[PDB]
């Protein structure tokens with residue numbers, strides 16, 4: 159039986175919240191965020207991986223369009239194919255499309271595989287968050303209430319299951335009888351609760367949080 163509440167920040171597995179700015183790279187930030195947690199678990203080191211590396215390099219071949227959108231799964235596929243991803247320190251985020259300047263000399267992580275979860279199964283997402291670590295998910299963030307969110311458990315009656323914003327589910331919980339998903343965003347500290355939003359859990363795949371989940375792994 160799973161833990162009632164999970165918060166991977168308490169295990170030192172989550173990097174600082176990032177700020178994507180006018181570049182639509184949330185897919186890239188969700189992908190590194192998931193891989194940072196696996197890297198921490200394996201090596202004991204928490205390091206920001208280069209979202210910019212994904213923006214500039216995981217491009218046409220992976221169905222991604224850099225600052226105009228992308229997918230976490232094919233981002234993971236690029237890191238597998240590329241046999242590494244640079245540290246964010248060595249490949250900083252500039253919030254625009256650049257030439258791919260990946261440099262294996264500054265490889266901070268690798269990716270062995272990635273696993274996708276079934277559409278809509280919040281129970282399965284719960285299990286994956288408890289047993290594997292933070293999970294990359296899309297959410298429907300095209301709502302003013304989302305941008306304007308400050309605290310508490312978010313619920314948007316007009317939310318759809320059609321995701322359009324990549325985020326990181328770093329845990330789950332319960333606040334005053336309202337179940338939520340603990341979601342790491344890429345809009346800086348001033349969005350929501352220190353850059354995090356707690357979104358309704360077990361409310362029929364609210365905002366599509368469980369539409370398209372996936373997490374990577376770094377194998378021995």
Ligand SMILES: CC(C)=CC(=O)NCc1cc(-c2nn(CCCN3CCOCC3)c3c2CN(C(=O)CC2CCN(C(=O)OC(C)(C)C)CC2)CC3)ccc1C(F)(F)F
Pocket residue numbers: 184185220221222223226227228229230232295296297319320321322323324325370
């Ligand atoms: C480049 C761009 C701009 C990308 C983008 O958008 N990224 C957002 C996003 C998409 C998906 C996602 N992954 N996958 C599966 C992988 C597909 N491939 C990826 C690359 O190659 C390998 C496989 C789907 C979706 C979105 N998706 C839906 O939501 C379902 C549809 C329901 C209703 N619609 C419909 O009927 O569409 C018609 C009308 C026919 C056009 C529209 C949407 C369709 C299927 C998952 C996560 C994210 C997020 F980044 F946010 F995290």
